[PDB]
Amino acid sequence: EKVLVLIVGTNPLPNYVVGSHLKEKYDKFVLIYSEKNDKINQNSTYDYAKKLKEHLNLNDKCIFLPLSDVSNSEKIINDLREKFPSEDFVEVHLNYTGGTKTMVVHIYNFLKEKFIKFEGSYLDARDYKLVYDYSEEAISLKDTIKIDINTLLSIHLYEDIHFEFYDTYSYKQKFVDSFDKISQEIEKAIKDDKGEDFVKWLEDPFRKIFKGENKLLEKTAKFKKHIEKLLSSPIVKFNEKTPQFIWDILNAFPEGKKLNDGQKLWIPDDKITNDNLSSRVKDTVEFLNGKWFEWYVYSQIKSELLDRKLKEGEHFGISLKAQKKDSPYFALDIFLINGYQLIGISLTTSSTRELCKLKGFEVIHRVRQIGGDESKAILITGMDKSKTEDLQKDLAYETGSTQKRFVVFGIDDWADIGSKICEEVFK
Amino acid sequence: EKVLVLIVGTNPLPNYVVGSHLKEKYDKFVLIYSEKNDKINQNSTYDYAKKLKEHLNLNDKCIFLPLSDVSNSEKIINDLREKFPSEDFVEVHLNYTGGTKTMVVHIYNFLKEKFEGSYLDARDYKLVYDAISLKDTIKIDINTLLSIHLYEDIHFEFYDTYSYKQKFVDSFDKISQEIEKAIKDDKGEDFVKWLEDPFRKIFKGENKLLEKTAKFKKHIEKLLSPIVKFNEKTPQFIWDILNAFPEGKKLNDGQKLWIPDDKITNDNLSSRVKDTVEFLNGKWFEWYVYSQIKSELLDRKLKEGEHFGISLKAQKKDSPYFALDIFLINGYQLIGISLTTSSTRELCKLKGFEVIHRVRQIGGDESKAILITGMDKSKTEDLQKDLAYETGSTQKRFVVFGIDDWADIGSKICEEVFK
DNA sequence: TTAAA
DNA sequence: TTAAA
RNA sequence: AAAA
Ligand SMILES: [Mn+2]
Ligand SMILES: [Mn+2]
Ligand SMILES: [Mn+2]
Numbered sequence: 131e132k133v134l135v136l137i138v139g140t141n142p143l144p145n146y147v148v149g150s151h152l153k154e155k156y157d158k159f160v161l162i163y164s165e166k167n168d169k170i171n172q173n174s175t176y177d178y179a180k181k182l183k184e185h186l187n188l189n190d191k192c193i194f195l196p197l198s199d200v201s202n203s204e205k206i207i208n209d210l211r212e213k214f215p216s217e218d219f220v221e222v223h224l225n226y227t228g229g230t231k232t233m234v235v236h237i238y239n240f241l242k243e244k245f246i247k248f249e250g251s252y253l254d255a256r257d258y259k260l261v262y263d264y265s266e267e268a269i270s271l272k273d274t275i276k277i278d279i280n281t282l283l284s285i286h287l288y289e290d291i292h293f294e295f296y297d298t299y300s301y302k303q304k305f306v307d308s309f310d311k312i313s314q315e316i317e318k319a320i321k322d323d324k325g326e327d328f329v330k331w332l333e334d335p336f337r338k339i340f341k342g343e344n345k346l347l348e349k350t351a352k353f354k355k356h357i358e359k360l361l362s363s364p365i366v367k368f369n370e371k372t373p374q375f376i377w378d379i380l381n382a383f384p385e386g387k388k389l390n391d392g393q394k395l396w397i398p399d400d401k402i403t404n405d406n407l408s409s410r411v412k413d414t415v416e417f418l419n420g421k422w423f424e425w426y427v428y429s430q431i432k433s434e435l436l437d438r439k440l441k442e443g444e445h446f447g448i449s450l451k452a453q454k455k456d457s458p459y460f461a462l463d464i465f466l467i468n469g470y471q472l473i474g475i476s477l478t479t480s481s482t483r484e485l486c487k488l489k490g491f492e493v494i495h496r497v498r499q500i501g502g503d504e505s506k507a508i509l510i511t512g513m514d515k516s517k518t519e520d521l522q523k524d525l526a527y528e529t530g531s532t533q534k535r536f537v538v539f540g541i542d543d544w545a546d547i548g549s550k551i552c553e554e555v556f557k
Numbered sequence: 558e559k560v561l562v563l564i565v566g567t568n569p570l571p572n573y574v575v576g577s578h579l580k581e582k583y584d585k586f587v588l589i590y591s592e593k594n595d596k597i598n599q600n601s602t603y604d605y606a607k608k609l610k611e612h613l614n615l616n617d618k619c620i621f622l623p624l625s626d627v628s629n630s631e632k633i634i635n636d637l638r639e640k641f642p643s644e645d646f647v648e649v650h651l652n653y654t655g656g657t658k659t660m661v662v663h664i665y666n667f668l669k670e671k672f673e674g675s676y677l678d679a680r681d682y683k684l685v686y687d688a689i690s691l692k693d694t695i696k697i698d699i700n701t702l703l704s705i706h707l708y709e710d711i712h713f714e715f716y717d718t719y720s721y722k723q724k725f726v727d728s729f730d731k732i733s734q735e736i737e738k739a740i741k742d743d744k745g746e747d748f749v750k751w752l753e754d755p756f757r758k759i760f761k762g763e764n765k766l767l768e769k770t771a772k773f774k775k776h777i778e779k780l781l782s783p784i785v786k787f788n789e790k791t792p793q794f795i796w797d798i799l800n801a802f803p804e805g806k807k808l809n810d811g812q813k814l815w816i817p818d819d820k821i822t823n824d825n826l827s828s829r830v831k832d833t834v835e836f837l838n839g840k841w842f843e844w845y846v847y848s849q850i851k852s853e854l855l856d857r858k859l860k861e862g863e864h865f866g867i868s869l870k871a872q873k874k875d876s877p878y879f880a881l882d883i884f885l886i887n888g889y890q891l892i893g894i895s896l897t898t899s900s901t902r903e904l905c906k907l908k909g910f911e912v913i914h915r916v917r918q919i920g921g922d923e924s925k926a927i928l929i930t931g932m933d934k935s936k937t938e939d940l941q942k943d944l945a946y947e948t949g950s951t952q953k954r955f956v957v958f959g960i961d962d963w964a965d966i967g968s969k970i971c972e973e974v975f976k
Numbered sequence: 977t978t979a980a981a
Numbered sequence: 982t983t984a985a986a
Numbered sequence: 987a988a989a990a
Contacts, residue, residue: 137990138990139949139987139990140947140948140949140990141987141990143987144987145987147987148987164949164990166951168951170678170680170681171680171681171950171951171952172680172681172949172950172951173947173948173949173950173951173990175949175990200990201676201678201680201681201683201685201989201990202685202688203674203685203686203687226658226662227658227987228987228990229990230676230949230989230990231653231654231658231661231676231989231990232676232685232990233990234658234661234662234990235653235661235662235665235674235676235687236687238662239666250630250662252628252630252657252658252659252987253987254628254629254987255987255988256597256598256599256628256987256988257597257598257599257628259628261628261629261630261659263630266631268629287947332980333980333981337980337981341979341980341981342981359779416978416979419978419979419980420978420979420980421978421979451977454942457942457943458939458940458942458943458977459977460943460977461977461978478979478980479979479980480979480980480981482980482981483982484982484983484984485980485981487911487982488907488908488910488911491907491910491911491913491914492906492907492910494910494914495910495913495914495944495946498946499946502987503987504987520877520982523873523876523877524876524877524879524982525914527914527917527918528567528600528707529567529988530566530567530591530599530600530602530627530657530988531598531599531600531988532593532594532595532598532599532600533598564988565988566988566989567988568988568989570989571989572989574989575989591988602988627988628987628988654989655988655989656988657987657988658987658988659988660988661988676989677989678989679989679990680989680990752985753985753986757984757985757986761984761985761986763981764981835983835984835985838983838984838985839983839984839985840983840984870982877982878982879982880982880983897984897985898984898985899984899985899986901985901986902977903977903978904984904985904986906977921989922989923989943977947990948990949990950990
């Protein structure tokens with residue numbers, strides 16, 4: 131009977147990692163967790179212990195040991211002696227990575243006196259190594275222990291998750307037999323260092339013409355009044371000062387979905403109805419105003435992830451959505467898992483500081499919610515390099531690592547965004 | 558000699574609190590910190606230990622002990638054997654609250670060979686010996702708190718140095734009193750709706766419209782209609798709020814919207830409009846809440862500028878500054894308050910992320926963030942659930958208030974903060 | 977519970 | 982480094 | 987997983 135003992139704190143991922151690596155060598159498993167006590171402002175980590183038992187397949191070889199007070203040395207010592215298994219064990223391995231400082235201090239010494247092979251362990255979050263106290267070995271688990279998106283979100287209490295594959299992408303369904311032509315044309319301009327010029331034309335005249343009153347592109351009356359009120363106008367900027375590579379992008383859409391009417395801007399007559407207007411520009415405007423960039427970035431990384439033996443739908447995906455039980459859901463543009471570190475990618479074409487700054491707070495908090503406190507967040511913006519370096523420094527929080535856990539890319543990174551994501555995440 | 562040993566992690570506040578309370582009873586102090594080794598992704602907590610020595614006035618009775626690897630047991634014990642003071646100490650007290658788990662285990666065991674251990678419970682605000690409540694015993698100011706978290710250039714305003722008191726001098730008290738009456742009479746929801754329509758449809762068209770008369774006159778023409786709703790369907794209490802403003806800073810020409818003639822220059826427009834629009838668009842709500850909180854804390858022991866203030870801004874060295882609407886310190890816990898008048902879920906969610914992260918940066922991982930919005934009760938509850946994060950405690954660290962709380966917001970903040 | 981403004 | 986949109 |  132070889133027993134492995136884990137300390138269940140509020141970060142379940144370290145215990146899942148050590149469990150996945152050591153279960154093959156032990157016969158019994160003791161999960162020490164906290165009880166809920168409102169009077170001392172103590173919540174319970176029991177939900178994580180069940181998820182640890184579930185996703186490690188411990189079954190009845192798992193012993194749950196609750197602690198009444200995780201900050202009282204006496205109660206911890208007492209609760210251990212009363213509830214710790216008294217069977218004669220040959221080996222006792224305690225990984226003291228989780229829990230409070232009082233938990234690790236007193237559990238360790240209680241099991242250092244009671245015992246018989248003994249070994250203390252700790253998983254390093256910085257360099258991904260399992261350090262043994264007496265064996266003096268530091269084995270890396272970075273490339274060996276794996277985890278998929280379902281397991282990772284589940285042990286963090288997130289259920290009902292869905293996402294899109296490369297083949298089931300939403301705008302492929304909307305632009306059948308055109309999507310590849312539209313996406314190949316955009317990609318070529320972005321790889322031709324036209325990203326900056328695109329986002330300027332997108333701000334003016336594009337967003338001046340095709341944005342404003344809600345349902346502007348679905349009621350011809352609203353769109354009629356808007357173009358009249360645009361009669362210095364963005365229409366001439368579009369008609370007369372639109373560069374050629376955008377004309378190539380605009381003409382990549384099918385004629386029935388082109389924003390242009392030749393080499394000028396399509397304006398509906400009084401014959402064109404509400405549904406006619408919507409069927410022409412709605413999907414094309416929504417794709418050009420931002421959705422295209424989600425697909426572009428995902429397309430520039432899928433090959434590099436498959437080369438590293440990652441599997442789509444388990445280790446990367448697009449348009450992920452998840453939620454806790456009976457709680458609102460959230461959306462994440464792209465997700466990636468390197469070994470067992472979550473990387474969440476949030477995308478925007480905006481170049482405006484305030485908007486991107488708020489995007490940064492968002493992606494930081496979401497990856498902590500679903501991947502634990504060692505996740506990495508990447509924000510990709512249309513800002514210049516000075517603005518992106520400013521944002522990283524603005525939002526950086528110090529956890530004890532030299533490597534950044536919040537990364538901002540900008541408009542100068544778009545043309546080679548594949549390799550830059552690859553270097554940031556895996557190197 | 559009686560020596561106190563602290564473990565310097567990346568949260569310096571528990572070490573300040575434990576240090577403030579136990580400095581009196583001890584002679585020497587050992588601060589065990591981490592070296593910087595980029596090759597193992599390990600950064601140094603030396604900057605925090607220096608701040609601990611400075612703001613606790615440890616002077617030369619403080620000994621910095623570095624560790625080359627805070628993740629490796631043997632490398633720790635070695636650096637502990639070769640560096641820890643071998644002088645004869647009659648009493649040794651190790652507080653193992655900070656640092657990594659390896660640090661607290663092997664430093665504890667090292668010192669036990671040569672003894673008392675203590676720990677500061679973040680959940681019940683007590684120091685526990687291997688239990689004294691410090692919640693109302695140890696105090697800190699905004700300057701000390703941000704400084705130990707490495708922030709500098711801290712500035713903020715007082716009730717009497719509020720910026721808009723200098724922009725509407727001889728009229729701010731009437732303006733603020735008018736707005737407060739409307740919110741005290743449960744008209745917050747009505748006010749919010751009128752700001753969304755037609756106020757922000759007229760005065761928030763695009764960029765720098767309130768600065769260029771050409772841009773403003775153009776926007777007026779396209780509207781000609783929210784100008785009609787403004788002139789005709791504006792509630793009486795809102796006309797009273799508008800007419801409380803100085804005449805050269807009024808948005809209304811009599812009982813109708815003012816329209817600049819070609820004569821009005823860019824300086825004449827902005828001086829008449831820009832300050833008034835920005836205050837009504839939402840800055841008023843910052844002042845309203847602050848005035849209510851300063852009222853409720855009139856009996857408590859907090860001093861303005863040490864434990865609460867408005868419009869806090871600070872920065873790290875060579876780093877961008879942030880802005881925080883209101884700050885409060887209860888004992889040694891930072892309470893950050895972000896205010897918005899918006900009723901929109903998307904906008905209020907993004908403000909929630911912001912205030913959760915900011916208070917964590919400047920006040921440590923045990924800070925409390927409060928977001929005050931103009932949403933209804935169902936949306937505020939949904940937002941609290943959406944953004945909640947498990948900390949180990951049963952009391953919430955992210956709190957959202959909505960439009961129904963505006964009238965009694967002073968009592969609401971007092972009850973949430975002081976428990 | 978679009979994306980950007 | 983507006984607060985809203 | 988460096989006041990769970
Ligand atoms: Mn699976
Ligand atoms: Mn996005
Ligand atoms: Mn605010």
